Amino acid sequence: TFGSGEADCGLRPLFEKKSLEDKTERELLESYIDGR
Amino acid sequence: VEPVDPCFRANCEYQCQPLDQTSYLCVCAEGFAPIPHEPHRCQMFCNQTACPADCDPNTQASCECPEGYILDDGFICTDIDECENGGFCSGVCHNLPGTFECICGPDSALAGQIGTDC
Amino acid sequence: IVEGSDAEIGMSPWQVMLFRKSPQELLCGASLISDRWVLTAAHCLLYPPWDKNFIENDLLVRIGKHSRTRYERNIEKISMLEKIYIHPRYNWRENLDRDIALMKLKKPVAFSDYIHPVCLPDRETAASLLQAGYKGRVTGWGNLKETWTANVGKGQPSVLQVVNLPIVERPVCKDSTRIRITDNMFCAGYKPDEGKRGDACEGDSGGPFVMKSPFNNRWYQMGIVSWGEGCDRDGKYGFYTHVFRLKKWIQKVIDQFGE
Ligand SMILES: *[C@H]1O[C@H](CO)[C@@H](O)[C@H](O)[C@H]1NC(C)=O
Ligand SMILES: [Ca+2]
Ligand code: NA
Ligand code: NA
């Protein structure tokens, strides 16, 4: 069914699928680090 | 009083061409033709890969394209290739400027439909 | 998109362009959530006060696009709309609360390097990612500036724009406007003291606010560009339709009206 969490979504052919990162992708990942 | 120009009393959007002393016909500029349901009005047509879009100079960048065409760079209407695009015809598809031909079967002779799917 | 930059080819394969047929122009953005379903904002399609009411035949759904104006033949794909489903409790009367609509495509779109659906958040993803300070990403072909008056800018972009904006805590969003904020919305953008800026703008509506999961590396659509007051002003923040909060309704119409 839809919204099950098993569908192949969210992975970009030109990026994740080829192990390539886009220009500002790191910026979002770095925002997760919380200051203690 | 012979003879009367029928166009004097006509209300055509673009031009008027007389037929009789009583009848006339509203016509359009080259690249345009009367709207079937609005004969006194004009709408753009295109039978090639692309033709300039019908843009209104009273409002910046407001352009029109005939059915089967889509606005492209340089304010030009370019043909939508429904066959290459997919989803328009499930049978055999032949692209046309403005529409497409869809052949449906799988019976004998096969029906050639214009602008519609099987 | 204000203060954004050119998106890279294939950077947002889920980005959809809702295109008006007459006149030929950009209507709004949207997102591909499956091979036959597209998500957008309800106000892009329906707004009674201005007599706005777009139907299936008034638009073209363009997927896989990069350039705003070019007809990207053999790259982008045009899909015909089978049915538009506007949220029944969409509050156009006041808040634009539940600013969301679903569009079922007549035929399934072909996935490719430029076309591919984004994931929708589940309970855990929503809880973990939707936090103040965390940055999300918004994309669109809308205005580069608040325009509609005097302003120095290129007006409309030549290529899809992208901006990374951090989620803002609810009370700060609340105090930034006199408009009532519901739980079906969240706001994002930088605060005056951060220096960095950026925001969504006219024409960006329906576009997705996505976040990349540090857990499974997948992108999820947490929001839909919904509304704001001006564009990229100090003390103002773009407001987005909270996707997870309305996920029950999304799953309901997709299950009832088929996938
Ligand atoms: C407008 O008409 C369409 C059908 O053509 C309908 O889906 C929509 O709800 C109507 N909305 C208004 C505000 O009239
Ligand atoms: Ca064609
Ligand atoms: Na004419
Ligand atoms: Na700002």
Side-chain angles (χ1 to χ4, degrees):
Chain A
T1 59
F2 184 87
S4 64
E6 297 306 303
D8 189 38
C9 54
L11 292 184
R12 303 171 295 176
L14 270 27
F15 291 98
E16 291 74 22
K17 251 58 191 285
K18 297 196 300 180
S19 301
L20 296 180
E21 296 194 350
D22 67 60
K23 291 185 301 178
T24 60
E25 187 182 308
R26 187 181 176 169
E27 175 179 4
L28 310 174
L29 190 290
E30 290 194 281
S31 64
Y32 298 138
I33 299 167
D34 301 324
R36 301 176 183 168
Chain B
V1 196
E2 59 203 280
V4 60
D5 181 1
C7 286
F8 179 71
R9 296 177 65 252
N11 195 10
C12 303
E13 172 191 315
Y14 192 70
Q15 285 174 170
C16 181
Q17 287 180 339
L19 291 170
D20 286 277
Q21 189 184 296
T22 50
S23 64
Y24 63 92
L25 200 284
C26 285
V27 292
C28 308
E30 57 188 83
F32 291 78
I35 307 186
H37 291 97
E38 281 280 86
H40 279 70
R41 287 180 59 233
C42 303
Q43 63 182 2
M44 175 196 170
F45 73 74
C46 188
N47 303 295
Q48 301 175 231
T49 284
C51 295
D54 175 26
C55 310
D56 186 347
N58 271 148
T59 165
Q60 184 172 135
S62 177
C63 306
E64 309 293 325
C65 285
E67 297 178 67
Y69 284 84
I70 183 174
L71 197 62
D72 200 355
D73 283 328
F75 301 101
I76 301 171
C77 295
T78 185
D79 178 58
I80 297 174
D81 186 343
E82 292 94 343
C83 306
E84 179 175 82
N85 187 91
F88 288 95
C89 176
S90 49
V92 183
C93 190
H94 299 310
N95 188 34
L96 281 161
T99 181
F100 63 95
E101 190 198 13
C102 189
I103 287 77
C104 306
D107 301 89
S108 182
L110 295 81
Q113 310 173 103
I114 275 54
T116 53
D117 195 0
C118 307
Chain C
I1 300 290
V2 188
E3 291 289 313
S5 63
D6 293 5
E8 298 172 73
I9 296 297
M11 185 190 236
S12 316
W14 33 81
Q15 178 72 34
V16 172
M17 181 190 283
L18 294 187
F19 197 75
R20 191 178 177 175
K21 290 181 181 179
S22 182
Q24 296 270 311
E25 58 182 18
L26 162 79
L27 175 86
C28 268
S31 65
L32 217 235
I33 56 173
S34 91
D35 71 347
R36 230 180 170 194
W37 289 89
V38 170
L39 192 58
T40 195
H43 85 259
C44 284
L45 300 173
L46 171 74
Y47 194 60
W50 303 340
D51 295 67
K52 174 183 294 175
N53 187 8
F54 291 105
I55 65 168
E56 347 290 333
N57 310 310
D58 295 331
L59 319 163
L60 289 181
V61 174
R62 305 172 68 185
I63 321 174
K65 294 191 53 59
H66 182 61
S67 163
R68 182 187 122 259
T69 55
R70 198 173 74 82
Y71 177 40
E72 295 159 307
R73 202 180 293 277
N74 216 207
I75 296 174
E76 75 171 272
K77 254 65 201 303
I78 297 171
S79 297
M80 291 180 291
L81 290 175
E82 186 175 350
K83 195 70 177 185
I84 287 161
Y85 298 90
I86 302 179
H87 198 301
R89 300 179 64 201
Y90 158 53
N91 198 2
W92 53 266
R93 195 78 68 162
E94 183 201 316
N95 270 183
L96 243 50
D97 185 30
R98 284 178 289 262
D99 191 7
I100 186 167
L102 276 169
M103 300 173 121
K104 191 184 185 183
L105 309 182
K106 282 180 184 175
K107 295 294 180 179
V109 312
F111 291 173
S112 68
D113 287 338
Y114 320 104
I115 303 177
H116 197 84
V118 65
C119 299
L120 286 196
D122 59 17
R123 197 190 63 189
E124 264 48 70
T125 303
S128 305
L129 273 37
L130 272 171
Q131 298 179 73
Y134 287 20
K135 291 178 179 177
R137 171 182 290 171
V138 187
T139 45
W141 290 278
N143 298 332
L144 297 171
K145 266 179 169 59
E146 190 180 319
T147 59
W148 44 268
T149 185
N151 221 187
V152 184
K154 304 193 70 175
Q156 300 187 249
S158 60
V159 159
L160 183 65
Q161 297 298 286
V162 59
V163 66
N164 294 327
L165 301 176
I167 307 175
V168 181
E169 37 291 279
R170 300 198 72 83
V172 175
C173 295
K174 186 176 65 179
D175 300 346
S176 71
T177 183
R178 299 185 176 193
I179 301 180
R180 188 186 62 240
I181 306 307
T182 69
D183 284 75
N184 298 322
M185 24 174 118
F186 69 85
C187 94
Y190 297 98
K191 304 177 176 184
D193 289 353
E194 299 185 280
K196 290 190 62 167
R197 45 204 315 132
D199 189 13
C201 202
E202 184 185 288
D204 286 319
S205 285
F209 174 99
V210 303
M211 298 186 80
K212 185 176 182 175
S213 180
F215 308 122
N216 65 191
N217 288 0
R218 296 191 185 262
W219 291 85
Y220 289 82
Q221 181 176 358
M222 314 305 288
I224 302 173
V225 178
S226 175
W227 67 274
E229 290 171 299
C231 293
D232 190 48
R233 294 175 179 180
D234 289 320
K236 292 289 176 178
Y237 307 87
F239 281 85
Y240 304 78
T241 302
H242 199 311
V243 173
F244 184 66
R245 287 276 309 188
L246 291 316
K247 195 187 173 68
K248 209 179 180 179
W249 174 78
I250 290 173
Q251 293 175 313
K252 181 173 178 296
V253 353
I254 288 177
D255 288 334
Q256 181 188 346
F257 304 103
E259 308 189 28

